[PDB]
Design a protein around this ligand. Structure first.
Ligand SMILES: Nc1ncnc2c1ncn2[C@@H]1O[C@H](COP(=O)(O)OP(=O)(O)O)[C@@H](O)[C@H]1O
Lengths: 132, 195, 373, 100, 256, 48, 191
């Protein structure tokens, strides 16, 4: 229940993955999870992020396949560098810096799973020239 | 021989690719379970420098999905009421069209139950039209192998009360096929081309 | 098979040891080492006089073991096929070898090359052109096998003495010289090959550069001891040196295949004697007057028109040709060997450009200190 | 000899491979398409006025491969769904569809 | 077989980070993985990268290992999330190329027929080159030359990925690598253009000097064929300036 | 928003004309059995 | 439970397609592979056996996995026309089995040799010393005709099993026919 002026050290390649994934699925509101680790309470660092195809159901916890996520994590461990899951990201063309109801529900599920599981809004269409 | 390795690859490839077909079909089918836009096909046969489609959405817009990216133009002809992707703006799957308000069910009886035994008097005529209509329904393969196409147009002319309606519904019941009744006298509509 | 081994242990001194090795190899079911033994016996210091008998024995062994190495088996038995020396049945022999090994390995393509060689040796009209073209047409997805590549190069180099290919014949002879590096054959015959390639370059028309043979040591050292006038003439064609006396001595030094085309030699040397100016002066002397042309080519005034026309056609000089002053503008788009021993000139010009560029950069920096400092 | 059924297995593999290539083309596309509009005004060589069939007209760019001679004024074209730029030009047709 | 390749400003930093994160325990200096992307119109582009730990021995350069199952699973996941992405080549660090590259190409070309090699200089930033592309051509070294490997460099240019401009502007937001301050920025443009020209032409002069000395093998067969025309092209004649004495000098004086 | 339904397939799918003019087909919500819903009756739809 | 992770490097030399065994020595070695992998699977279906090649290449596609069908399919039609590179083959098998695996998984490299080899005694002794320093556990099985259990192979095995090591034997097979059961009898439960 302690949340100070926390800061996210996000990575440039995570940004590039975000922008590519959003540019691909502009109208599908594609989903993903922000691969970061709580090195301490508030200095959260994310070095990598992945892109996952939103299932036909839409924004659902099962759309992020558990077996597929586990296999992806094992692949990252074998080649690359392992990294924990304490966050998520989502291209949000509809409206701005808030979450829809289903987004809030799945973020509640992510909070129950993880410790924080930060809710990250990244608008793909509003970011055009200078403001992401 | 090579068959062992060949079939070892064959079963795996078939099952895995059918699983991939299932995955793609589900990801498209929940969207096919959420189609929203009517399909006014302004068909342009854009052959890739094969086909293409212009869809008039219910929300008054035009979507030019390339090469009709899920269904075949053979079954999808220029018309309406074929599933369109709400998110992917693509022709999703066919679905039944609309039968012109009145003809959706004007007076269509799903199945008549009147029997041939309760009518009579004109038994020779009724047997003649039975041979001309019901037999082309039950023993249609008989005509098919004979090579003679059965006639279709049968005109029962006679004063009212002679049982044409009952005979027709009984014939339809004997065929066990669909029966559609047309109310002729009210087919004269003021609207242009309405009939 | 034991009876054939017993019979085959005869007919040669030292052969029964190799026949015992063969017996062991088919007892333990060895095919590749058996092909090596067959290679050793065929390349043994003997003429293989019993060519038909050894053909029969080898076919017997290969038909009752039916698992030998195909490409190497054909590479070896082609010697016996050629040695049998009867083309009418040699074609059937090649068909039989194709049927015994019809795989897409070196075997079938070597059989095609043997067919082409037979058609050269006799009947040079039946399938010669189709065979020679189809070798390259079938060398697809085969970048560096190099074996049947050398074979095809040899066939087309020998096809040089046919109407179809002269310059391409020289090109594939060069390809053979590249693909096979060691001498692996007499220096005198390599010198004869160099003579033939030099005559091909001299008689040819499209061979203006004709690279990798002008100053190539592998080709020149063969005739370094005999007919060094040929070496000098090729160096003349390379560097633009005229040496008209030595080149005429070349024209009548090897009389066959040169006396009829000495005129073409004249035209080619007049064509190629200007490239020296062309690369040595980077538009430093861009006034190719009639007197300069006369100094360069020892040619008359009316022939200058035809010479510069052919130069424009081939690609030597593409500039404007005047006649009030007879000035020829200098652009070259067909580079060739620049005598790497004389690379000092281009190195000096490049370092001159470097010095000029750096000096002007420093000068503009001096003028621009008021902003850059 | 199980090897003589290789032909039947080959037929099965070809039959299923036709379906597999069909599904590959079906899923590889997964496209959103392009919106349909008309060249309301060419404006200039760079920017063009393209009006959707149902309201808004926009000042957009043109497809790189296409040219103004292929675009022309008053011709049906396709704009990018999101970035709103010309992607392809299409022919149009009208039909009286009565007593034909 | 491809005409040319174009590298995005999208995979370079990803490769560098992969090198950094997998070199913590692997100090082989040899990072080997695959670059995925798309090839459409004789222009090949790279959109994704992946690194695999990789150990070499100098003994004939034939000692190595990879995680091919994990790499293939990665490729399947990448194609599932984005179908247009495909393995366009394989990349190795260590610009001093060794001899296992042929075996690696032979093994990986089952994913890509025109197998290409990519070298990324993580630590080196020599002038501006982030990476180099390599095409495999073993179809005879030359018309009259012996057999060789001869991996040639297909021309590479840094592309312009979309939607990354916002991110790169926010990231830097300090140098402003744009034409801002037109006069001074173009002065800097002239300055580093002269710097690059001088450095590269000095390198060419050094190569000519070393060919003259003959300490290194001479690839003259393309060197003179490409540099003779460069040298003889008549950009030194000034009579065209005589013909165009007012080349723009009229515009100079109207601007004055 | 609430719109009437048009018709359905054999059982699972429902082809509906919707007051947004929409060619609307949905999986009926898990709490609602297909038996209760009949053609030409008005149902509300959850925008998501 | 003590689980075993085994990496087999298989000799794809130009000779292996000869018919010394009934089908081909190559198919005989493939049968040795699939029977030993069957034994591993019967011990525990999640025991993992991987393939390595040494015919001027190192096949890693068939990784350290329990399934045997991939080994069978990928080793079939291996085109045994190239040479033998023993020093590269066992070393790359070591690197491939050095990859991510359980620490409980006992690392073991098994080699199949069926053809005569022309390599340097000095080079192979250097490799044996390097593997002795690296504490490598490799057992080698021969098949068919060869200088079976040559001096190089014997010294290599002695270096890898001595100094109170596992004690993995190398069998001196008769040329041609051989008894795979007698070849793999000892190391399947002892070594
Ligand atoms: N053969 C018959 N058996 C029983 N009822 C009959 C028969 N013929 C006519 N009807 C009666 O006549 C009515 C149908 O009249 P209608 O169909 O208008 O006659 P028509 O077909 O000659 O115009 C039915 O209600 C039926 O009860």
């Amino acid at each position: 229940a302690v949340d100070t002026a926390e800061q996210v050290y996000i990575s440039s390649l995570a940004l590039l993955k975000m922008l590519k994934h959003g540019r691909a699925g502009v109208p599908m509101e594609v989903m993903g999870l922000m691969l970061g680790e709580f090195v301490d309470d508030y200095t959260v660092r994310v070095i990598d992020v992945f892109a996952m195809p939103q299932s036909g159901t839409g924004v659902s916890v099962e759309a992020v396949d558990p077996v597929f996520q586990a296999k992806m994590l094992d692949m990252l461990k074998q080649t690359g560098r392992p990294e924990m899951v304490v966050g998520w990201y989502h291209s949000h063309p509809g409206f701005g810096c808030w979450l829809s109801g289903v987004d809030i529900n799945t973020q509640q599920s992510f909070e129950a799973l993880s410790e924080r599981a930060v809710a990250v809004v990244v608008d793909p269409i509003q970011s055009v020239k200078g403001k992401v | 021989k090579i068959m062992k390795s060949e079939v070892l690859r064959v079963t795996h490839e078939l099952q895995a690719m059918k699983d991939k077909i299932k995955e793609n079909s589900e990801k498209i089918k929940v969207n096919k379970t959420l189609p929203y836009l009517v399909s006014n096909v302004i068909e342009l046969l854009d052959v890739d420098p094969g086909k293409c489609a212009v869809i008039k959405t219910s929300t008054r817009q035009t979507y030019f999905l390339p090469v009709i990216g899920l269904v075949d133009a053979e079954k999808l002809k220029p018309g309406d009421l074929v599933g369109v992707n709400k998110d992917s703006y693509l022709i999703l799957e066919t679905l039944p069209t609309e039968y012109d308000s009145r003809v959706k069910a004007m007076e269509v009886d799903e199945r008549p139950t009147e029997q041939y035994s309760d009518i009579g008097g004109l038994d020779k005529q009724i047997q003649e039209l039975v041979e001309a209509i019901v037999l082309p329904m039950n023993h249609k393969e008989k005509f098919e192998n004979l090579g003679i196409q059965p006639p279709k147009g049968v005109l029962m002319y006679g004063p009212p009360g002679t049982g044409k309606t009952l005979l027709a519904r009984a014939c339809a019941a004997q065929t066990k096929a669909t029966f559609l009744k047309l109310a002729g006298p009210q087919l004269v509509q003021m609207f242009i081309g309405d009939g | 098979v034991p009876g054939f081994l017993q019979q085959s242990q005869n007919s040669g001194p030292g052969q029964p040891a190799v026949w015992h090795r063969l017996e062991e190899l088919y007892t333990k079911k060895l095919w590749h080492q058996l092909t090596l033994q067959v290679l050793d016996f065929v390349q043994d210091p003997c003429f293989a006089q019993g060519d038909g008998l050894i053909k029969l024995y080898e076919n017997f062994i290969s038909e009752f073991e039916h698992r030998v190495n195909p490409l190497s088996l054909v590479e070896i038995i082609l010697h016996v096929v050629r040695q049998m020396t009867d083309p009418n049945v040699a074609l059937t022999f090649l068909e039989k070898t194709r049927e015994k090994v019809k795989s897409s390995d070196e075997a079938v393509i070597l059989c095609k090359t043997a067919i082409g060689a037979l058609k050269l040796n006799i009947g040079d009209l039946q399938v010669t052109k189709e065979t020679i073209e189809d070798v390259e047409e079938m060398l697809n997805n085969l970048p560096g096998v190099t074996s049947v590549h050398s074979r095809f190069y040899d066939l087309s180099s020998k096809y040089y003495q046919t109407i179809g290919n002269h310059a391409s014949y020289y090109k594939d002879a060069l390809r053979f010289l590249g693909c096979v590096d060691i001498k692996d054959l007499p220096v005198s015959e390599q010198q004869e090959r160099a003579f033939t390639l030099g005559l091909a370059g001299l008689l040819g028309e499209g061979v203006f550069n004709f690279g990798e043979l002008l100053m190539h040591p592998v080709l020149e050292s063969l005739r370094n001891t005999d007919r060094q006038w040929l070496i000098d003439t090729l160096y003349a064609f390379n560097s633009g040196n005229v040496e008209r006396f030595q080149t005429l001595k070349t024209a009548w030094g090897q009389q066959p295949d040169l006396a009829a085309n000495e005129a073409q030699l004249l035209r080619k040397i007049q064509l190629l004697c200007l490239m020296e100016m062309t690369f040595t002066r980077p538009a430093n002397h861009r006034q190719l007057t009639f007197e300069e042309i006369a100094k360069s080519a020892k040619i008359t005034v009316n022939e200058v028109e035809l010479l510069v026309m052919k130069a424009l056609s081939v690609g030597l000089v593409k500039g404007s040709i005047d006649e009030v002053d007879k000035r020829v503008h200098m652009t070259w788009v067909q580079p060739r060997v620049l005598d790497l021993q004389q690379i000092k000139g281009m190195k000096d010009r490049l370092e001159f450009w470097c010095t000029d560029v750096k000096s002007m950069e420093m000068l503009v920096e001096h003028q621009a200190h008021d902003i850059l400092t | 000899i199980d090897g003589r059924l290789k032909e039947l297995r080959e037929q099965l593999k070809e039959l299923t491979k036709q379906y597999e290539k069909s599904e590959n083309d079906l899923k590889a596309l997964q496209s959103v398409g392009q919106i349909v509009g008309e060249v309301l005004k060419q404006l200039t060589e760079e920017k063009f006025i393209v009006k959707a069939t149902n309201g808004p007209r926009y000042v957009v760019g043109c497809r790189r491969q296409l040219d103004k001679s292929k675009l022309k004024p008053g011709t049906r074209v396709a704009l990018d769904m999101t970035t709103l730029t010309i992607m392809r030009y299409l022919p149009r047709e009208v039909d009286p569809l009565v007593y034909n | 077989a491809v005409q040319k390749v174009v590298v995005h400003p999208l995979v370079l930093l990803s490769v560098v980070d992969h090198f950094n994160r997998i070199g913590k325990v692997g100090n082989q200096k040899r990072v080997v993985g695959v670059l995925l992307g798309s090839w459409q119109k004789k222009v090949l582009d790279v959109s994704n990268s992946f690194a695999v730990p990789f150990d070499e021995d100098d003994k004939d350069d034939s000692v190595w290992f990879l995680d091919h199952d994990y790499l293939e699973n990665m490729y399947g996941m990448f194609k599932k999330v984005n179908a247009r992405e495909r393995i366009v080549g394989w990349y190795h660090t260590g610009p001093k190329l060794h001899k296992n590259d042929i075996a690696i190409n032979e093994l990986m070309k089952r994913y890509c027929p025109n197998s290409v090699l990519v070298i990324i200089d993580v630590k080196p930033k020599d002038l501006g080159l982030p990476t180099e592309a390599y095409i495999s051509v073993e179809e005879v070294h030359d018309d009259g030359t012996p057999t060789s490997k001869t991996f040639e460099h297909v021309t590479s240019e840094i592309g312009a990925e979309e939607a990354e401009e916002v991110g790169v502007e926010h990231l830097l937001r300090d140098i402003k690598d744009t034409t801002v301050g037109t006069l001074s920025q173009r002065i800097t443009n002239q300055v580093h253009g002269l710097k690059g020209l001088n450095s590269k032409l000095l390198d060419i002069r050094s190569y000519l000097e070393k060919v003259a000395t003959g300490k290194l093998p001479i690839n003259h067969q393309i060197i003179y064929q490409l540099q003779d025309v460069f040298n003889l092209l008549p950009d030194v004649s000034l009579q065209e300036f005589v013909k165009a004495f007012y080349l723009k000098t009229n515009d100079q004086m109207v601007v004055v | 928003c609430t719109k009437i339904i048009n018709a359905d397939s054999e059982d699972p799918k429902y082809i509906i004309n919707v007051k947004q003019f929409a060619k609307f087909v949905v999986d009926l919500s898990d709490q609602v059995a297909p038996t209760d819903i009949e053609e030409g009756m008005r149902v509300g739809v959850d925008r998501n | 439970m003590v689980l075993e992770s085994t990496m087999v490097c298989v000799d794809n030399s130009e000779y292996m397609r000869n018919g010394d065994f009934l089908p081909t020595r190559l198919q005989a070695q493939q049968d040795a592979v699939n029977i030993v992998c069957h034994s591993k699977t019967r011990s525990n279906p999640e025991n993992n056996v991987g393939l390595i090649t040494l015919a001027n290449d190192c096949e890693v596609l068939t990784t350290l996995t329990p399934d045997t069908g991939r080994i069978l399919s990928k080793l079939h039609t291996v085109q045994p026309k190239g040479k033998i590179t023993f020093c590269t083959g066992i070393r790359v098998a070591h690197l491939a089995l050095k990859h991510r695996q359980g620490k409980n998984h006992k690392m073991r490299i098994i080699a199949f040799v069926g053809s005569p080899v022309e390599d340097n005694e000095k080079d192979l002794v250097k490799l044996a010393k390097r593997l002795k320093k690296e504490k490598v556990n490799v057992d080698i099985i021969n098949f068919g005709e060869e200088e079976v259990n040559t001096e190089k192979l014997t010294a290599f095995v002695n270096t890898l099993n001595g100094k109170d090591g596992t004690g993995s034997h190398l069998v001196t097979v008769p040329p041609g026919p051989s008894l795979a059961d007698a070849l793999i009898s000892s190391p399947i439960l002892a070594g």
